[PDB]
């Protein structure tokens, strides 16, 4: 009825929500809940501070403003964002039209009900495309919460310049956006119990750059005791666009653009703090290809060291981990080079690789042998003349390099160092009339299934005409996801109840057998996902660097 | 909070080190890291470590100390450490550091030999070291490509190989691998040499026993493993799988003797020779000790007629089985009131039943078949004893039924004591019972999923609450009818004393105001408050799943310690409250330059004593502070009273101590006073 909850900061009023589905029970939504103080004035480019208390009843019946951003085709990167996002900007735009620097708010979805009793698990979704845009408001956790009988939280953190600007020194340490996320988790741990949540069973999950955030949080000591499990969908801390390695370089470009480029880094930051946030956001700062300008940085505090070094040396706590990738992540990578015949020419193929080698492997001596070796491996020698097969393999190259290889590296190291690991490959999706008929599951295509969108039918954000199979698969994914959250095991406690997953137990991932779950209409457990191509990037190519 | 400041940490380097964010030291030296902290109230500091629970350098190391100290550090003690500092105000302060213990073990040098024109030898040099090692080869003189050197794949810089493509006479010399760690942390280089000669050859072995060796228990078996080639002279070593060699087995070295061999000694015994040349030679012998155990029979009524009972005009199978080591060598003999069989009664040695099971069938059962059947398993001319299984068939023989006697379906016991679960089975013969758990898939006291029992009793010596649940008992398929097992369930309650909340709570409140204390029971079997008893300073008081007490007026007469003794029918557990109107302790302010030298003369200095009041509005207002000053050296103390004007949460208070001898230190005890009296006192040591 009238959901009121008293927190450590004051009384909050929620709003009941019915779902467009007769089996799903209604949910309680708390929208626009402040979890930190406004990062304005002297608090810009500074860590978050706890929120101020209130003495009356605060309303949480609508989303709060989103963090400053410019997605109206303001030169955003399509290769990093999920296809559902880039292909529907008009609808997406409506979710971020109301902006403010005061944007540190989160949303809570509470189920109104099953089997085992006691405090319910909490799943915190971390959104992220390129660190420059987005909002948790885009992800309705109502179905996931109601169906799985878990609490779902979506978070809004400082984005782009305001959230990640760093001068490479003490003037601006960066990672403000990550600190907000940590702060949001703190708020959750301290107040979710008042909503019936279990602070001892907090699972963080996210897709894309959101997935990158999840992993970066697991490498920070600031996450100790905060949460117990993590789910990383199509995102790692090892990809080329997960971290900004030249923050100072881009910070000064921005300063020059706004007239703040002074010698002293401290005076430079103070100058930026005087500028209107809109002035900083509207600037054109293009990073290196396949990389980012403003984003998480290795500050030695929030992020103690290069994720690669930390993971190789097992310098991280043992969380329960679930991670995976989609069959055709890199659709947008080739979508732009496809001819009117849905194929790719041999010359275009060479060009793509050439651009690929130069951008990722900026080595002066030896790029030749590299390009040729890469072309050979991703050439289908059986049917080598087919421009369409060429398209598929090229797509695989980008997919393997940017998503599959880093994910396997993460899984291998996590399991090797004792972290319970589960791996998946998403080979299903719902094709809209906006994507090519030849495309496979692309980046972000698993989101609708994880959120249970098929159960409530097509939405404004996700207009695909979901089939019965989509509903069935969606139920399965939600069962696995929430099972992991409840027990750390995708198979417990809810069995998969024709349902093709009835007799399919998801075995734990290990570096020796590398078992993973093939998620599709014909699900089953396999071994060593794309082992050959994955090992090429992880073992041989690094060797060609000449050590 | 005006003056309250969030914690702030800073790591400092000490102890033995070498040569930014990382603390590199030599293995065996001593680590000393100090964590300097600031902020008010003074934050606490704990050094901890972050390591993958299940691999390599892992230790559980939580120390509450601003200094981390690891004496005689080791490889594994290395890793990433973080100093956490918190005080309640704001976000805890964290600082990270990587301790990089360094070392250089002794290098290992191995060599391998290898159309038909040129002979080629590979000299492989391996060493474990941090940092990654540098290799240098020499044959008296340093070698370059002028032969080939390189690092192979599947090596992280720990390995280099020297390839001698054409083995010319000058190459037959002493090769030495000299490995260096760049002398970082002042660590010396190390060398290993090998004598390459045209007689150099890998090891080779000859065994004095066959591939597989069968033996009887008690027999003494000795195995000679001798070298037949190898230069340098290889080292021979015996090994056993599963487990270790002894007892009753001694290795002279080459000679392996097993005395009075037992059946459990069976397995693989491997002799291996090594000389760091080529692949090590290994001879393997599989020793099998003979044995016969667990003779069992099965009564299988007519399957095709779907029967579960002996009925005239039906087929009746009487099977037989025994567990043996040379399983293929067993032979069964079926006797029937003596030893006979063609017509009607026939022999079958290998049906779908367990491996190597002899089973005779009785077609068209008949009163003439009612008798005592015996099966005898034996080894062809083996000294071991024979084994037998008797199985009486008669009108009385009948499949089994199982039930729970009386009302022991659910049996309750208190934790710790012994528990005895009971099922009773009926039938002729009575098969053993197999107990399993049903509510979950866990093991048992015996550590396995199921336990065998003939008396139908399941005994639990030290019963644990974990055992509390549902248990299944069912008839075996052996030593009786081979029929769908009969089942029956029993509940097991493991009672235990209650646990209440809060265990302790320090309650503060004004003098005239009231307060209510609740003691809640969370767990406890029975989950019911048998009785709740509130007590005050030892005396009992006067008086639902929980218990409540209301103190009408928090006065000096009513203020004290309340105890609620909640209890089930098995044990007692109590909450403990501390009720009073005492003010909280003052919080000394530590982050300021304090002393003031009196003209550097008269041996006098003065100290700027500073502090805050924790939760000033938690009780009656602070009137005055009692300040005590002792010099450590002497007992006598200078007592004074600071009068509070007024205060709010976070307001800093100050007081100068005018006359203090220049070199000695002093203790400072500061007590708040309210209408209730003296609050919680705090202490501190000041010094010039
Ligand atoms: C003595 O030998 C007999 C065999 O003649 C042993 O009985 C056997 O016990 C094992 C495990 O206790 C049974 O394994 C079973 O396999 C089936 C597969 O369908 C499974 O459904 C069961 O849950 C169980 O795992 C096996 O069937 C059973 N054999 C017979 C003929 O009953 C007995 O345990 C041995 N006892 C001793 C003291 O050596
Ligand atoms: C901290 O540890 C050092 C040595 O490790 C010891 O000398 C000192 O007394 C300890 N002090 C505290 C407050 O723990
Ligand atoms: C090996 O060298 C020895 C010198 O010690 C020489 O006598 C012999 O003829 C050489 N050839 C063989 C096959 O040993
Ligand atoms: C085994 O050795 C013991 C003494 O070591 C000896 O007394 C015994 O007779 C021997 N038995 C056999 C069967 O060799
Ligand atoms: C002995 O060799 C066998 C195979 O020949 C192997 O299975 C076993 O593990 C070995 N045991 C030891 C101790 O090396
Ligand atoms: C073998 O060694 C045992 C002790 O290890 C010794 O008693 C026995 O006499 C030796 N026999 C032979 C033939 O080497
Ligand atoms: C079965 O019959 C034999 C025949 O002598 C007898 O000794 C035995 O006591 C009877 N009962 C059994 C084997 O349980
Ligand atoms: C109860 O005992 C404590 C023990 O020191 C004492 O402080 C308190 O005054 C006592 N309460 C009463 C009412 O006497
Ligand atoms: C120093 O302190 C002593 C008492 O401890 C006092 O008598 C004397 O006057 C003081 N002198 C000065 C210069 O403060």
């Amino acid at each position: 009825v009238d959901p009121l909850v008293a927190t450590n900061f004051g009384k909050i009023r929620g709003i009941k929500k019915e779902l467009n589905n007769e089996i799903l029970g209604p949910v309680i939504q708390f929208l626009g809940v402040p979890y930190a103080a406004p990062p304005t004035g002297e608090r810009r480019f500074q860590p978050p501070e706890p929120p101020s208390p209130w003495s009356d009843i605060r309303n949480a019946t609508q989303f709060a403003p989103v963090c400053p951003q410019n997605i109206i085709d303001g030169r955003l990167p399509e290769v990093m964002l999920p296809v559902w996002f880039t292909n529907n900007l008009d609808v997406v735009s409506s979710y971020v039209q109301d902006q403010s620097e005061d944007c540190l708010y989160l949303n809570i979805y509470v189920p109104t009900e099953r089997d085992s009793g006691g405090p319910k698990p909490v799943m915190v979704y971390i959104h992220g495309g390129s660190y420059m845009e987005g909002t948790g408001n885009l992800y309705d956790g109502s179905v996931l919460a109601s169906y799985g009988n878990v609490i779902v939280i979506t978070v809004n953190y400082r984005l782009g310049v305001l959230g990640f600007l760093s001068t490479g020194d003490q003037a601006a340490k960066g990672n403000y956006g990550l600190l907000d996320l940590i702060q949001a988790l703190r708020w959750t741990s301290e107040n979710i119990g008042f909503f019936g949540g279990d602070p001892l069973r907090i699972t963080v999950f996210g897709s894309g750059a959101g997935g990158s955030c999840v992993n970066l949080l697991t490498l920070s000591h600031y996450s100790e005791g905060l949460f117990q499990r993590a789910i990383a969908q199509s995102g790692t801390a090892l990809s080329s666009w997960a971290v900004s390695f030249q923050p100072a370089k881009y910070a000064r470009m921005l300063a020059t653009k706004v007239g703040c480029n002074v010698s002293d880094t401290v005076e430079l930051v103070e100058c930026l703090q005087k500028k209107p946030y809109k002035e900083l956001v509207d600037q054109d700062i293009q990073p290196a290809r396949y990389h980012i300008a403003f984003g998480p940085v290795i500050d030695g505090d929030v992020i103690p060291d290069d994720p690669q070094i930390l993971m190789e040396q097992g310098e991280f706590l043992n969380y329960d981990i679930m991670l995976g990738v989609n069959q055709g992540e890199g659709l947008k990578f080739v979508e732009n080079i496809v001819d009117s015949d849905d194929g790719i020419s041999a010359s275009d193929f060479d060009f793509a690789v050439s651009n690929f080698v130069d951008n990722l492997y900026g080595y002066p001596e030896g790029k030749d042998v590299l390009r040729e070796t890469i072309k050979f491996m991703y050439t289908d020698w059986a049917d080598r003349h087919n421009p369409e097969t060429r398209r598929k393999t090229l797509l695989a190259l980008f997919t393997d390099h940017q998503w599959v290889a880093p994910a396997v590296a993460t899984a291998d190291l996590h399991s090797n160092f004792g972290s319970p690991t589960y791996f998946y490959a998403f080979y299903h999706h719902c094709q809209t009339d906006q994507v090519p008929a030849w495309a496979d599951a692309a980046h972000g295509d698993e989101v609708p299934y994880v959120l249970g969108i098929p159960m409530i039918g097509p939405t404004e954000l996700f207009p695909c005409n979901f089939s019965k199979n989509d509903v069935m698969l969606s139920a399965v994914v939600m069962t696995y996801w929430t099972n992991f959250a409840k027990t750390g095991d995708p198979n417990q406690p809810v069995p998969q109840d024709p349902n093709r997953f009835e007799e399919v137990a998801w075995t734990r991932y290990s570096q020796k057998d590398q078992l993973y779950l093939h998620i599709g209409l014909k699900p089953r457990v396999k071994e060593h996902y794309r082992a050959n191509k994955v090992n090429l990037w992880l073992e041989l190519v690094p060797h060609l660097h000449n050590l | 909070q005006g003056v309250y400041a969030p914690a702030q940490a800073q790591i400092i380097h000490a102890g033995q080190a070498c040569v930014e964010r990382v603390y590199t030291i030599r293995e065996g030296d001593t680590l000393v890291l100090q964590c300097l902290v600031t902020g008010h109230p003074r934050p606490q500091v704990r050094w901890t470590k972050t390591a993958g629970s299940a691999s390599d350098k892992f230790q559980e190391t939580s120390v509450l100390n601003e200094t981390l100290r690891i004496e005689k550090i080791q490889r594994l003690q290395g890793g990433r450490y973080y100093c956490k500092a918190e005080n309640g105000v704001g976000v805890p302060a964290i600082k990270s550091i990587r301790v990089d213990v360094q070392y250089l073990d002794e290098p290992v040098l191995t060599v391998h030999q290898t159309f038909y024109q040129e002979k080629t030898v590979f000299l492989r040099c391996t060493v474990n070291s941090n940092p990654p090692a540098r290799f240098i080869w020499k044959r008296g003189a340093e070698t370059l490509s002028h032969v080939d050197i390189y690092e192979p794949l599947y090596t992280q810089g720990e390995t280099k190989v020297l390839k001698l493509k054409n083995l010319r006479p000058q190459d037959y010399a002493s090769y030495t691998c000299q490995v260096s760690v760049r002398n970082v942390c002042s660590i010396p280089d190390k060398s290993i040499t090998f004598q390459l000669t045209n007689t150099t050859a890998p090891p080779a072995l000859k065994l004095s026993v066959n591939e597989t060796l069968v033996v009887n228990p008690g027999d003494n078996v000795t195995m000679q493993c001798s070298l037949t080639g190898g230069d340098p002279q290889p080292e021979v070593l015996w090994s056993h799988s599963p487990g270790p060699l002894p007892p009753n087995s001694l290795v002279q070295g080459g000679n392996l003797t097993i005395w009075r061999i037992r059946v459990e000694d069976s397995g693989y015994y491997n002799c291996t020779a090594i000389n760091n040349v080529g692949n090590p030679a290994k001879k393997t012998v599989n020793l099998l000790v003979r044995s016969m155990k667990n003779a069992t029979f099965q009564i299988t009524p007519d399957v095709i007629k779907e029967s579960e009972t002996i009925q005239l005009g039906q087929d009746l199978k009487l099977s037989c089985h025994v567990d043996a080591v040379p399983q293929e060598k067993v032979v069964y003999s079926w006797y029937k009131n003596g030893k006979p069989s063609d017509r009607l009664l026939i022999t079958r040695n290998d049906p779908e039943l367990p491996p190597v099971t002899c089973s005779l069938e009785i077609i068209d059962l008949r009163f003439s078949d009612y008798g005592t059947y015996l099966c005898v398993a034996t080894f062809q001319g083996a000294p071991i004893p024979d084994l037998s299984v008797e199985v009486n068939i008669s009108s009385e023989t009948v499949p089994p039924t199982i039930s729970v006697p009386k009302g022991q379906s659910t049996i309750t016991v208190r934790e710790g004591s012994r528990a005895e679960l009971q099922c009773e089975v009926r039938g002729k013969p009575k098969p053993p019972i197999i107990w399993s758990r049903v509510d979950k898939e866990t093991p048992m006291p015996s550590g396995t999923m199921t336990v065998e029992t003939y008396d139908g009793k399941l005994r639990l010596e030290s019963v644990s609450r974990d055992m509390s649940g549902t248990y299944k008992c069912q008839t075996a398929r052996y030593n009786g009818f081979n029929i769908r097992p009969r089942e029956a369930l029993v509940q097991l309650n493991v009672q235990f004393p209650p646990v209440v909340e809060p265990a302790f709570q320090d309650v503060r409140q004004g003098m005239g105001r009231s307060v209510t204390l609740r003691c809640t029971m969370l767990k406890g079997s029975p989950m019911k408050v048998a009785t709740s008893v509130w007590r005050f300073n030892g005396t009992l008081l006067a008086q639902q799943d929980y218990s409540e007490l209301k103190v009408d007026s928090v006065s000096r007469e009513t203020s004290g310690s309340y105890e609620c003794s909640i209890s089930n029918d098995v044990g007692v557990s109590a909450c403990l409250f501390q009720v009073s109107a005492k003010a909280y302790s003052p919080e000394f302010y530590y982050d300021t330059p304090n002393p003031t030298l009196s003209q550097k003369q008269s041996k006098n200095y003065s100290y700027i004593l500073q502090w805050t009041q924790k939760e000033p509005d938690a009780v009656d207002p602070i009137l005055k502070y009692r300040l005590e000053v002792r010099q450590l050296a002497q007992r006598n103390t200078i007592q004074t009273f600071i009068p509070v004007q007024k205060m709010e949460k976070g307001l800093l208070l100050e007081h100068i101590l005018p006359n203090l001898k220049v070199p000695q230190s002093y203790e400072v005890r500061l007590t708040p006073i309210t209408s209730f009296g003296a609050g919680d006192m705090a202490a501190r040591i000041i010094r010039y």
Side-chain angles (χ1 to χ4, degrees), chain A residues 318-322 414-415 418-422 484 488 508-509:
Chain A
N318 280 145
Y319 305 84
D320 293 317
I321 300 296
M322 176 184 196
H414 260 294
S415 53
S419 300
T421 306
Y422 294 85
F484 182 72
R508 279 168 69 177
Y509 178 92

Side-chain angles (χ1 to χ4, degrees), chain B residues 602 604 659 661:
Chain B
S602 81
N604 294 347
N659 315 317
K661 301 298 185 253

Side-chain angles (χ1 to χ4, degrees), chain A residues 408-430 432-542 544 546:
Chain A
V408 174
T410 297
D412 284 345
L413 285 168
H414 260 294
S415 53
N416 181 70
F417 282 106
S419 300
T421 306
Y422 294 85
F423 198 98
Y424 70 84
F426 209 82
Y427 277 56
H428 187 67
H429 69 302
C430 185
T432 65
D433 308 335
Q434 182 73 252
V435 303
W438 51 258
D440 295 272
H443 186 56
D445 276 349
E446 84 292 353
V447 174
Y449 295 90
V450 170
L451 295 184
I453 301 301
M455 292 202 172
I456 53 101
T459 61
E460 194 166 304
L461 188 60
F462 297 105
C464 198
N465 292 11
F466 297 110
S467 66
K468 285 182 177 295
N469 277 319
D470 284 317
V471 175
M472 177 276 292
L473 194 141
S474 180
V476 168
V477 171
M478 288 191 288
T479 288
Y480 282 130
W481 263 235
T482 60
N483 268 355
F484 182 72
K486 295 166 181 176
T487 68
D489 183 330
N491 306 292
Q492 302 301 324
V494 183
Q496 290 290 357
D497 184 349
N499 186 328
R500 303 117 180 189
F501 299 70
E502 274 192 344
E503 298 84 355
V504 181
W506 191 340
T507 318
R508 279 168 69 177
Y509 178 92
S510 65
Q511 185 178 348
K512 258 41 165 28
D513 302 301
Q514 300 180 314
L515 297 101
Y516 69 99
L517 178 65
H518 177 94
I519 302 177
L521 293 183
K522 187 190 181 195
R524 61 199 127 78
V525 171
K526 302 184 146 186
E527 307 178 83
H528 311 292
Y529 188 62
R530 296 185 63 72
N532 291 324
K533 297 300 187 211
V534 169
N535 279 277
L536 162 67
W537 294 116
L538 297 183
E539 288 294 334
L540 183 58
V541 167
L544 303 177
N546 201 351

Side-chain angles (χ1 to χ4, degrees), chain A residues 221 301 304-305 309 315 318 417, chain B residues 52-53 80 82 94 96 98:
Chain A
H221 319 273
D301 184 1
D305 208 359
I309 296 175
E315 303 178 1
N318 280 145
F417 282 106
Chain B
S53 72
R80 198 151 253 274
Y82 77 79
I94 317 171
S96 249
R98 150 130 76 223

Side-chain angles (χ1 to χ4, degrees), chain B residues 50 91 137 238 283 394 402 436 447 623:
Chain B
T50 54
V91 295
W137 292 92
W238 278 99
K283 285 297 193 181
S394 68
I402 193 168
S436 60
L623 321 175

Side-chain angles (χ1 to χ4, degrees), chain A residues 48 50 183 186 221-222 224 298-301 304-305 309-310 313-318 416-419 539 547, chain B residues 21 49-57 79-82 84 90-96 98 100 151 153 156:
Chain A
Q183 172 59 21
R186 232 164 221 300
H221 319 273
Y222 284 79
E224 169 119 341
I298 301 170
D299 66 308
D301 184 1
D305 208 359
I309 296 175
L310 299 179
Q313 241 110 337
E315 303 178 1
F316 51 95
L317 298 175
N318 280 145
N416 181 70
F417 282 106
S419 300
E539 288 294 334
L547 304 136
Chain B
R21 209 183 280 78
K49 199 185 167 183
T50 54
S53 72
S55 193
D56 296 79
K57 41 211 70 182
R80 198 151 253 274
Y81 287 73
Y82 77 79
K84 178 157 164 237
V91 295
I94 317 171
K95 287 293 241 277
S96 249
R98 150 130 76 223
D100 187 38
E151 309 184 337
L153 162 64
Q156 294 267 114

Side-chain angles (χ1 to χ4, degrees), chain B residues 536-537 556-560:
Chain B
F536 177 85
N537 270 22
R556 235 155 313 98
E557 286 308 321
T558 65
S559 55

